[PDB]
Amino acid sequence: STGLIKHTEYMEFLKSVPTFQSLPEEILSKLADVLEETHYENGEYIIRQGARGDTFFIISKGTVNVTREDSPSEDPVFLRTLGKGDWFGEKALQGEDVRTANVIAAEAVTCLVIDRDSFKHLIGGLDDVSNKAYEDAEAKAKYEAEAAFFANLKLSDFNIIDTLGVGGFGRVELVQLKSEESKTFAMKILKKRHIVDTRQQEHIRSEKQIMQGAHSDFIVRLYRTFKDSKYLYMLMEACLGGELWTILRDRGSFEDSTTRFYTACVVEAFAYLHSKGIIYRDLKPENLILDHRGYAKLVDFGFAKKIGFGKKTWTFCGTPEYVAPEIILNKGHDISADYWSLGILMYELLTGSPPFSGPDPMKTYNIILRGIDMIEFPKKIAKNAANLIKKLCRDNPSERLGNLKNGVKDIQKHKWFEGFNWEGLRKGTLTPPIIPSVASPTDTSNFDSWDIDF
Template sequence: DVLEETHYTDGDYIIRQGATGDTFFIISEGQVRNDDNSDKQVKTLTKGDWFGEQALKGECFSLSTRNIRFCEPAFVRTLLCLTLRSFKQLIGGLEDVNNKQHDSDEVKAKLQAEADFFSQVSLSDFNIICTLGMGGFSRVELVQLKNDPNRSFALKVLKKRHILDTSQQGHILSERCIMMEAHSPFIIRLYRTFRDSKYLYMLLEACLGGELWTLLRDRGSFDDGTTRFYTGCVVEALAFLHSRGIIYRDLKPENIILDPRGYAKLVDFGFAKKVGLGKKTWTFCGTPEYVAPEIILNKGHDSSADCWSLGILVFELLSGSPPFSGSDPMKTYNIILRGIDMIEFPKKITKSAANLIKRLCRDNPSERLGNQKNGVKDIQKHKWFEGFNWDGLRQGTINPPFTPAVDGPLDSSNFDYFPEDTEDPPPDEESGWDLEF
């Protein structure tokens, strides 16, 4: 993302003897050699070779005791260049990324007790109360534990035949794997999965405060303080995922849900993927208004695509609608590719909020806030978050801007009404791909 192309013709000098430099070079096209006639051991470098790597280890220094220049005639040749400044801005502090956050013994004990409890329950231990939501591949039911009426959960029900017909097996198994390990207060918990001949089931934490999208729809837009709180919750969730090499890829108000206190959590990990730290993926997915330009252009994307989507989310929460929107997805994508600087910001978006949005939505992923050497700390330290109590957010001690009205564990009044599912899908007689579920 930070490499820049430079072009040379035959005989052009790249480095002159004794010069100091701060740039690392990779040969993209052509041949380069040390131009020193007195040395019979001259080495010719070709495509894929490099020189000047010492420049990335410290400050500027003498790169060569020889001249280095292109030696092929009659063609323009290409080098890829990386300066020390760009390297430090993007990579600096990478050695800290692999410092894993170890759970305390108390947390480990709690998680183990939880796992032991849920390993003993079965589908027959629950009563279905009502439907909380519907998606393209599933519906979510509010269920009650029969032997403990005060405990309720959300049961995501997926039709196996529909998953097979749309070739979503990989996404479903990835969603399960990621969510089972996502122990963050800002990500909805997955406790257990089940399966039978027709359905797959995911037993989830019940957050009965409703979708953030519903609250935004009813209010039109949020003020700075309200948006800052919900954005802070999302930043914490993304920080957890990104530190583990996971990208979310479907950030939008519909996928943010409120717990009874009013704290926000990410839900629906159907597009999430574990790619590893510093690696990219090329799957085209996401909601059109929130898709980053590198996904549209099929350049490969990583966690920086979530930083872009975070900027879109802040804009939508503050204004009531996303900045990029067309009458169909292709028109939306074309508007996105024009860039955030072509968008006129409403007056209700303050100067510091606009600055945050624009820095999150830079076209070049390497320039995005949250995707540089300090990671999400750069977002948390932005002027728009000045004075925000991050420790209080993590500890759950600050008051949310909105407290949902939730009258007990079976109250679904914060969700829209959905009719019962009357379709009876055929059983899956395939090869048993869901055995891992």
């Protein structure tokens, strides 16, 4: 029972909200009848974090503040302000038996409150709608806090602990903050003179811009850079699980389920980069590094480039075994060159060897041009793994899986990924196939023995 004039005002309000706009008239009338119009004064907690919850809210008037405490002995973090037409309180009805944040009225507020049963019977659910309607405010809030913390650091705040590795143009040291000894990072130190002489000034500029601007759990973070008279310093996330190439060399080859977890980490890093118009171009096992948990991340962005949408790039680059045919033939390429590399990766992880391999680069390129159908697949490759490999390594870039109508979803929805927990991977709750042994924040035992904006 609801007054007719008020029942019609809610119906009109619910139609104005895009989320609920497409519901049938009879549902909108049931919602308009079952809802409760609750008013709140400025300062009132609509929801308290930690409390039990069984109601969903749609703001019909005013604004609210959303905050969240990480630890009890920690500062509540501001996440976001919500206003008229926004909604909240669905997380405790969809997997948490607990409110995950506080919602405080920031002026005179009115919410249309819906019970858990009505939320499921009438609205259905927002498991697919809350992920897309709202962006990750917790990630944004963390990046803002991290950006302030890192902006206030100097080269004098660090101690060198050990060496993670030495590349062709610089050494990666494990560094630690003097004040917070538990907080370690990977510091890449590059000689300025060496960058000029090897003609890598643009490659270093691009690598900093892309890595520093990238915020993904499947991509090694570049927190910031420093610079002095002779060197450039790149403060990165320390991934102490080791390089995937050494783990592969040791085990010989990875089982189907192991390979699947690592390929999914790459699919997530590519879904992220490709949504920003960035091409990676250097996928290979030596560019995948495990953090202390066993989660794989992309680490080298020397060939990566922001190319935008619907346009190709022309530079020859990559590792001979992983380079796509249109790159070999210098005919221009786009993000679909990355999906070709993913097929190569799957094949190398499952067998220990890449599909196309000659004694030198020129022979390898010739073998790549004959295509994936001239390669004898070992019987240990599962039929669904082989099928995805062959759909990724199509000679015609236009036909590659990942580059069709639904983009990266087509890869994610392939038969090989049936029963793979993509949300658990994105949340970090999925158990990795290889658990690394990391004795402390200083354990490097899993590793073997133009500059104005820097």
